[PDB]
């Protein structure tokens, strides 16, 4: 007889099902995990990020990475919005382009 346990990442979490009726390559619960068809490893964590020192005191609600703009050169920027205003940052300075 043989009892191998391979392809730990072929299938991930299977809840809502009798844990005593699943396959050995399954889990009843998981968090911060990443599977590619044969393997399991810790998921990449988090970390802060600041184009400028002025954005670290801002609560953004949404944004989009605009790649080009007539005034801007061949460099991308961001169009981020807040509770009251819309801001733009391009790794050099912050500007409020909210409609006046």
């Amino acid at each position: 007889a043989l009892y191998p346990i391979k392809s730990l990442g072929a299938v991930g979490v299977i809840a809502d099902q009798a844990p005593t009726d699943l396959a050995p390559n399954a889990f009843t619960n998981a968090i911060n995990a990443r599977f590619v068809e044969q393997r399991v490893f810790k998921t990449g964590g988090n970390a802060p990020l600041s184009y400028v020192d002025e954005d670290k005191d801002l609560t953004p609600l949404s944004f989009v990475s605009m790649p080009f703009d007539y005034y801007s050169a061949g460099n991308s920027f961001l169009v981020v919005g807040t509770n009251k205003k819309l801001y733009k940052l391009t790794d050099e300075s912050l500007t409020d382009i909210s409609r006046k």
Partner: protein, 286 residues
């Protein structure tokens, strides 16, 4: 108002033609007037712009909400946005038609919208639809009913992955290529996601296409949080390449998106740290 930002501009400005409606007086004398139009969501499709749940006002400006109204603008231009939203054009006595259909469905609210391979897919929590755009004729778009029970949960709980849509039909996840839908969480995580999302704030649920690693997670608020919070804490990530479910935590995301990193992480150069030193002046995670 939507407050578009032109390509050749450096400030935000209201959309052109927003509120324009053609009026014809006695003897057939045309004229245009702008009314207070307010929308809830706007997207792009077929070189056009759309609108959902329009609060279309009028003379005697007691506003009448039309949660099933859906307007579409003319085609785009060279590095500019559309310039006509009026449905009553061509009334001053060939192409560039704008209009609406005023759908008829259940629970209305016409929350979301998203395109798929030239075919729109409207979602309003029930009775989804499909958009068939024609070249040019009286009926440029003919909407046909698709489902009776399907319907998106929140205004941003849908995203295209592979010629299909990743939707949350109030009970589970579905992945339909068109005319046929499936269940990605039939009897695996259904009772878990419904339980974890139905506690604090389901409307805050979101999604994002993590194409960088073939993953589509559905952000939602954690189990223990204030009922007034919208900062998604946990996420259920699904790999569309091997059909596996997994969860993780996020740092209280109100939104999400993809963008290039700062110059210090976009690829730096030795002769750039002319002011930086080994004393990690507020920068260590390099």
């Amino acid at each position: 108002t939507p407050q578009v930002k032109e390509f050749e501009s450096e400030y935000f400005v209201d959309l052109p033609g927003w509120g324009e409606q053609t009026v014809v007086d006695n003897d057939g004398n045309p004229s245009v007037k702008k009314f207070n139009w307010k929308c809830e969501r706007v997207r792009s499709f077929n070189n056009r712009l759309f609108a959902l749940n329009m609060r279309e006002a009028n003379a005697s400006g007691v506003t009448t909400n039309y949660p099933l109204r859906l307007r579409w603008s003319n085609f785009a231009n060279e590095n500019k946005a559309p310039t006509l939203w009026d449905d009553f054009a061509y009334d001053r006595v060939e192409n560039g038609y704008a209009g609406y259909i005023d759908l008829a469905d259940s629970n209305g609210s016409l929350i979301d919208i998203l395109p798929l391979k030239d075919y729109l897919f409207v979602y309003t929590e029930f009775e989804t639809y499909i958009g068939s755009p024609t070249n040019n004729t009286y009926q440029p778009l003919m909407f046909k009913k698709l489902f009776n029970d399907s319907g998106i949960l929140a205004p941003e709980c849908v995203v295209e992955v592979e010629g299909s849509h990743f939707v949350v039909t109030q009970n589970d996840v579905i992945l339909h290529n068109g005319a046929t839908k499936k269940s990605i969480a039939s009897n695996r995580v259904k009772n878990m996601l419904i339980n974890e999302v139905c506690l604090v704030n389901p409307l805050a649920t979101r999604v994002h296409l993590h194409q960088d690693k073939k993953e589509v997670w559905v952000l939602y608020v954690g189990p223990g949080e204030p009922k007034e919070s919208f900062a998604c804490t946990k996420a259920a990530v699904w790999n569309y390449e091997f059909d596996t479910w997994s969860f993780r935590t996020i740092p209280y995301a109100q939104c999400i998106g993809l963008v290039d990193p700062p110059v210090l992480e976009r690829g730096p150069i030795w002769s750039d740290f002319q002011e930086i030193t080994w004393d990690d002046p507020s920068i260590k995670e390099l």
